[PDB]
Amino acid sequence: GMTEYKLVVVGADGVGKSALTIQLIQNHFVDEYDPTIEDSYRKQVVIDGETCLLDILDTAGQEEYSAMRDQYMRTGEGFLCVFAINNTKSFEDIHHYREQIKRVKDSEDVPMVLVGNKCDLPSRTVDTKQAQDLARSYGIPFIETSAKTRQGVDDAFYTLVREIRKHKE
């Protein structure tokens, strides 16, 4: 009936990790840029008729983290790997997050969703096709999101829960 899920939101500086989480939890867009150290949020949601208690870890994008990172990558059940569609460097950084999660988990089969955030902006530098091809090579879903409009936000989190559910079964 009731199941807890530990979700981890990872990605480079300013991709919108906090804004995506705050949209899901508080139903509003944060226009401010306030760097995260580490925050966690709970949310009880119904996904495919099942009562899920989400425990979401919102991580720091700030580079030079071999600190606290391995522990949450070990504890986390599923990962949202976020890049911003107008930030090519954040997309190139996905390889590093994916590889480190796989290394810490000691598995090639880790519940994960590739998230292309800021899809409300007409300043795209990363094509949907290139990100779709990367997710296909990883064997993971790819979802374009906007923390501003809330487009794809529920889809990204719910898809990740569905991926965790499949892994356990």
Ligand X SMILES: O=C1N[C@H](c2c(CNCCCCCCNCc3[nH]c4ccccc4c3[C@H]3NC(=O)c4ccc(O)cc43)[nH]c3ccccc23)c2cc(O)ccc21
**Site for ligand X, rule CB under 6 A:** 2, 4, 6, 8, 38, 40, 42, 53, 55, 57, 68, 71-72, 75-76
3-state secondary structure of 61: coil
Query: Does residue 35 belong to the site contacting ligand GCP (CB under 6 A)?
Result: yes
Question: What track of x and - describes contact with a second copy for positions 7 through 36 (by CB under 8 A)?
Answer: --------------------xx--------
Residue 72 interacts with, from ligand X, ligand GCP, a second copy, none (CB under 5-8 Å by kind): ligand X
Output the smallest distance, CB 137 to ligand X, in A: 26
Q: With the CA atoms of 166, 55, 105 and 71 taken in that order, what torsion angle do they form, in degrees rounded to the nearest 10?
A: -170
Query: Does residue 19 belong to the site contacting ligand GCP (CB under 6 A)?
Result: yes
Query: Does residue 135 belong to the site contacting ligand GCP (CB under 6 A)?
Result: no
| H or E, element range at 142 | strand 142-144
Please answer whether residues 166 and 140 qualify as being in contact, where contact means their C-beta atoms are separated by less than 8 angstroms. no
CA-closest candidate to residue 2, choices 40, 45, 42:
45
Query: Does residue 70 belong to the site contacting ligand GCP (CB under 6 A)?
Result: no
Please answer whether residues 117 and 128 qualify as being in contact, where contact means their C-beta atoms are separated by less than 8 angstroms. no
